[PDB]
Structures are given as C-alpha cells and as structure tokens.
C-alpha cells in the first residue's frame, strides 16, 4: 500500500478522486492499492496526528508527499517522522523539495532536488560559453549563505578559466532595516554580470532597490538559483527581463503527473527488491510506542530503493536525500513576462537556443552591440579545418574557437586553421568581439541571375559583416563588396604527373589534337572558372569533360591516370604538392603564376572597420608574424 497527502492549494477533491481511482494503473509490475489523505492546514500537530493515524491504522509500506504554498521549515518535520518510525517517504514538489544536507543519521527522506553545487556548476557552464567572467556576487543574510559562499569559491577553482572575481557583498535585505545603507552599497558597483542568492521576499526587495539605483538596464545580467523566483507560474513586478535561473526537469508538468511518478518509483523499488528476495517488507508504524533499533531488513530495502530507471528518466539518489545526475533546463524571462526555456543540460554538455544573448531595452526594440560582428566562412583544408568537439570535457581543445554550421537545431563544432589565427589576432588588436558560423550554400560565390550564394552572398545581402577564409580578389566581387589588403598571394597554376609551357601553349590554346586529347581540372562555380571562361571560349567549351568533385578526387584521378592536367589556385596546389604520397609536381613553379591576385577579407560597403583593420593587417605583415604562421601551417616534405 502507498499513501498520498496533499496540501494548501485549490481544493483537489476531483484530483484526489482521480488519484484514488486507478487502483490498478498498470504503471509497474504489480500495483499496491493506493489511498489518499488530505490535511486542511499545515501545522506540527496537524501533520503529526494525520500521518501517525494513517500509518498506524493502515499498515502502509511507503508514503508519498505533495507540497504546499512553499513555506520553509516543513521538511524537517518529515525528516523527524521518517527517522522515528522508519517509514520511507518521498517529497515531490514545492518548498518541501528543498535539499536538506545534514539529514538525520537513520532517516530515509529522499527529496527530489538539486544541491547548490550542481546548480552553481550549471551556472558557471553558461558563464563560460558566453565568456563573461565578471563575478559580482551578492548574498543576503540567509541561513544558508555561508554554504553558497563556500561553494562558489570551491567551484571557481574547479575550472580552466581564471574567473577573475570582482566583489562579494552581504546586506540586510530583511523586512526591517536601514534602506539608506543598502542604497549606498548598491550605488557603488561595476560589473556586467551579477549572481544573487536570497529569498523571494528578499529577491523582490533587492530587485526593487536595484531598479531604484539604476542597475537593471540593458547593460547588466542577473543570475539566481532556484531558491528564489517562487511559484514559477506568477512572476511578480520589479523582476528584470532576462533573469536566468536553473530548474530541474518536470518544471511544467501537472500535479497529477508528478504523483504518478512518485508511485511509479516506489513500485519499481519494491519490484526490484522483489526479484532479489520475493517479498515486500512488513510495515513498522507504532508512532505511540516509538520502538526500533537499527533494523537490517528495512535498511536493505532502503539501500535497494536508491537506484531506479523507467520511462527513459534516470533517478539516482545520492546517500544524502537528493538525486544526482539530473537533466537541468535553464529558463529565462521573455520580453512579455513569461518563463521560457533557453538551454538544456544533459551529461555535462550545455546547449543554448540563442548563439548570442538577446539584449532588450526599456521600450524593447532589441539593441545590438556596436563592437560585435558576425563572421562567415567555410572549410578549406590548409586554411579552415572543422573538427567535432572531443568527448573529453564538452568544450574542445584551447587555441580553437566555437563554430556552428547554421542551416534552429545546431551542433557546436569548433573550427581551426590559418585564417582563424589571423582572426584571433585581429580581435585581440582591434578590440572587438565576434561569432563564427559556416556557410551552407555554394562554396565561394556565383551570380545566377542576380542571386549570389556563398560568403559573398551572405555579405552582400547584409546577413554578415566580414567573410574570412579562401576568398580571392577579382573585378566582379570588388565592385559590390569591399576588400582589404592581400595577406596571402595566389594565382592560377597547373599540376601534372611526375610537358607544357603555360596557358598560351598550343596544348591548351588549340584543342585540336588527334590522338591524345588533354584533360583539365577546373572545379567549377569558383573564381578560376569565371576568368578562364571569360578569356578563352574554346577552352571553356572543351573543358566540359573534366573531373569536378573536389580538390581531393582530382588527386586520385591524376594518380590513377584518367586525367592529365589540373587547373586551380596556387596557394592550395603548391601546398597540396608539399605533403603527398611520392612526389607529384607542378610546372616550372612560382614563375608560372597567372592572374596573380591575393586572398582578402570581404566587408560590407562603406564599413568603418575597413580603415581600422587594414592598418592592423599591414602591421602584422610588416614585422614577420605571417612568416611564422606560414612555417607553422604551410610546410611540406617534398
């Protein structure tokens, strides 16, 4: 048998009947007969008398609690009762589901919640991803403030980033006290990120005071644990929009649904113990007698009661009465005063709905940071390399940047390469922030009747602000999108198998050879095939039967013997001939470069960045760091 108790809400007579009705709900192998009890008011004698009477006149094996208006100092009574009469109980919701760390020795409470350590871990896993590192910690004079202050420091030393702390302050945010002193202390602060710990009344007082002393505008960000924010279904006034909290799963289920989970976990625990010994332990419910030394049978049943799994939800209780390894979900206050999901957490890796933090204003109209820009690119093997994050610690190796392939759902890869290092140094010197995302359409750029795809398309239509990578310079692009000075020098080159004297040779100029027809490369839809077609019609006509899949399959075709000559860029062709199986070489060499242009950073027309960072590129080229990067990333054997 399993008991059920309600408290302090709209009278759930219909809910009580609906809970009592499924005497066989088929939610587990075997179903003990459920019974329901309801207390009118929450009080010490009321609760004590009801539970003692029910469990002494019913002979019950387990009992499931349901919470109330969320007042404190109620879980202690449950701990006391469970320790005395040795009956396992379980709290499911409200204020009684707040973790009690030093529980009684022989008690079996098992309240589903999360300790401050796990919540702080999740919060610092969302601070690291957006890279704030401000740490303005504010705590009121609360009973548990010392534990929070110890935990934040303990976790601060358990990560990679320095986490430069700025200030921690403790103030009397109670119903009665000097408001002027707290006003003075709040008026003197400077940090873009705040972490606060207090109670709901303390939260409302502190937020009202912060609104008075101008700390709630679009400049700062606030974070609170689940202890504050109260009901979750009625956000009061003076609560800043953009508040971030972390709550466990099932923050939107029904009261009836929660009880169904509570009875299921007890039923599986008995069933799991049933397979071991084929019995259900007898109840021990003499509240009046209050007997019982340490009992091994109930101890073994409780030990087997810890781990449970059903319906694809892992409930694993630590020795302390709180569950370990849950799947928390981060929530935030939308622009219309309504809690909404922002980012999940599942086996230690954090996700987010937004690649950047939306910042709102007093009259909404989401402001955009002036010193932040979006950069488009894609993968070119010598220059941009994409690697999936390692299963090591969630985030990938340092000296790499997060980078996501846009297409709502996203997978966070992290891109590496030469142009990435250039971008990192540019961000270091010009003092700006950025986010990087790969392109999905055609590689580099084309004009199919005014529709430009690729990075040039994403920049020309004002969906991006730069476009770094392997992006050469030509007459067409330079008309519609700006450009900066070249930093890597390329052209057109031919790779052969280790026979021609340039493009003007009759081998390529006159495709009228009888026995041997020569074969070309020309991976289409790129820069080179535009110039080649525009300047030599016959070659374009005769180049239809040319292998065109990538810069990878062309090497295989050349090594096989199905193709004779490759035409492509120079900076990638000569590098590709540096590290090769054997030694495949090109024509005469750097003397054979045709239409010698250079790589560049595209920009929206008339952008104020252009002048600022062209000088930085020139400075970087002047003193020779580019030579070091080239010798690190662009060296070969043969």
């Amino acid at each position: 048998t399993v008991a059920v108790v309600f408290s302090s809400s709209g009278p759930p007579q219909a809910q009580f009947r609906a809970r009592l009705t499924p005497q066989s709900f088929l939610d587990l192998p075997l179903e003990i007969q459920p019974l329901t009890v309801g207390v009118n008011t929450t009080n010490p004698s009321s609760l004590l008398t009801q539970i003692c009477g029910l469990l002494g006149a019913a002979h019950v094996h387990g009992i499931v609690f349901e919470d109330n208006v969320d007042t404190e100092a109620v879980a202690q009574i449950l701990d006391f009762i469970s320790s005395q009469t040795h009956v396992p109980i379980l709290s499911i919701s409200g204020g009684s589901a707040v973790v009690l760390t030093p529980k009684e020795p022989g008690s079996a409470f098992l309240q589903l919640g999360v300790s401050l350590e796990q919540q702080l871990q999740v919060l610092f896993k969302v601070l690291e991803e957006y890279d704030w590192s401000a740490f303005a910690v504010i705590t009121s004079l609360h009973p548990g403030h010392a534990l929070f202050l110890e935990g934040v420091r303990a976790v601060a030393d358990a990560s990679h980033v320095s986490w430069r702390l700025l200030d921690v302050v403790t103030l009397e945010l109670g119903p009665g006290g000097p408001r002027a002193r707290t006003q003075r202390l709040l008026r003197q602060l400077d940090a873009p990120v705040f972490v606060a710990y207090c109670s709901r009344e303390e939260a409302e007082v502190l937020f009202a005071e912060a609104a008075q002393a101008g700390l709630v505008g679009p400049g700062h960000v606030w974070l609170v644990p689940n202890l504050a924010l109260g009901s979750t279904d009625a956000p009061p006034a003076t609560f800043p929009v953009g508040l971030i909290s972390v709550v466990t799963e099932s923050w939107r289920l029904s009261l009836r649904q929660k009880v169904r989970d509570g009875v299921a976990i007890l039923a599986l625990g008995a069933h799991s113990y049933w397979r071991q010994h084929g019995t259900l332990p007898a109840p021990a419910g003499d509240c009046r007698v209050h007997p019982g030394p340490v009992s091994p049978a109930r101890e073994a049943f409780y030990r087997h009661l810890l781990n449970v799994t059903w319906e694809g939800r892992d409930f694993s209780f630590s020795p302390g009465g709180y569950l370990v390894q849950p799947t928390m979900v981060v929530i935030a206050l939308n622009r219309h005063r309504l809690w909404e999901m922002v980012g999940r957490w599942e086996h230690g890796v954090l996700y987010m709905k937004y690649p950047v933090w939306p910042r709102y204003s007093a009259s909404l109209q989401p402001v955009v940071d002036s010193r932040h820009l979006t950069v488009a690119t894609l993968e070119e093997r010598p220059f941009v390399i994409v690697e999936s994050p390692d299963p090591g610690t969630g985030g990938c190796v340092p000296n790499t940047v997060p980078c996501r392939r846009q297409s709502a759902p996203y997978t966070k890869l992290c891109c590496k390469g030469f142009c990435i290092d250039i971008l990192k140094k540019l961000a270091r010197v010009v003092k700006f922030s950025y986010d990087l995302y790969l392109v999905t359409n055609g590689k580099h750029g084309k004009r199919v009747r005014g529709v430009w795809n690729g990075m040039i398309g994403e920049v020309y239509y004002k969906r991006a602000d730069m476009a770094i990578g392997s992006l050469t310079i030509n007459e067409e692009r330079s008309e519609i999108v700006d450009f900066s000075v070249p930093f890597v020098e390329t052209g057109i080159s031919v790779m052969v198998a280790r026979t021609v004297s340039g493009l003007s040779d009759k081998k390529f100029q006159r495709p009228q050879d009888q026995y041997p027809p020569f074969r070309f490369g020309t991976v289409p839809n790129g820069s080179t095939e535009r110039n080649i077609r525009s300047n030599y019609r016959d070659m374009h006509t005769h180049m239809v039967k040319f292998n065109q899949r990538s810069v990878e399959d062309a090497l295989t075709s050349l090594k096989m013997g199905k193709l004779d000559a490759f035409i492509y860029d120079a900076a990638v062709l000569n590098y590709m001939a540096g590290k090769d199986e054997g030694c495949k070489l090109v024509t005469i060499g750097s003397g054979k470069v045709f239409a010698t242009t250079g790589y560049g950073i595209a920009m929206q027309k008339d952008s104020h960045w252009k002048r600022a960072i062209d000088l930085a590129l020139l400075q970087f080229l002047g003193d020779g760091e580019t030579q070091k990067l080239e010798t690190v990333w662009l060296s070969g054997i043969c």
Partner: peptide, 16 residues
Amino acid sequence: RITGINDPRLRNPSDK
C-alpha cells in the same frame, strides 16, 4: 630527416 624544430612527417601525421 627527423629534425627537432618541426618535421612535416611529424607535424602532419602519416600512416606508417
């Protein structure tokens, strides 16, 4: 030739 500064056989991993 396995140098100490950087070998392309070492800088770029090979199969053998």
